[PDB]
Design a binder for this molecule. Structure first.
Ligand SMILES: *[C@@H]1O[C@H](CO)[C@@H](O)[C@H](O)[C@H]1NC(C)=O
Lengths: 44, 50
């Protein structure tokens, strides 16, 4: 199972407390070891 | 004879719960590389029940 929790807020990480609600579950069944982030460049 | 259905004969490690293996790589019984070809200490893990 792949579970994703999330939280959004309008603001070094800040000092405070905020809990995260569950929003996604995916019945995948995979062996994961590595990952990467995807950007969106601003073309001139 | 029905050769369609197949099972697995060799694997390095035991499967975790609720896991599926679709890899068909040549199992290395020995230490020499198999080079993707059937040979000594190199067997195709998928076998046919027939
Ligand atoms: C998951 O992948 C890693 C990749 O190195 C491997 O070492 C490990 O044996 C794999 N586990 C399962 C349960 O397939």
């Amino acid at each position: 199972y792949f579970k994703i929790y999330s939280k959004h807020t309008p603001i070094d990480l800040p000092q405070g407390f905020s809990a995260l609600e569950p929003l996604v579950d995916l019945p995948i069944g995979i062996n994961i070891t590595r990952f990467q982030t995807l950007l969106a460049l601003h073309r001139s | 004879g029905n050769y369609n259905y197949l099972y697995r004969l060799f694997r390095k490690s035991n499967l975790k719960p609720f896991e599926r293996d679709i890899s068909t790589e040549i199992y290395q019984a020995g230490n020499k590389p198999c080079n993707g070809v059937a040979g000594f200490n190199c067997y195709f893990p998928l076998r046919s029940y027939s």
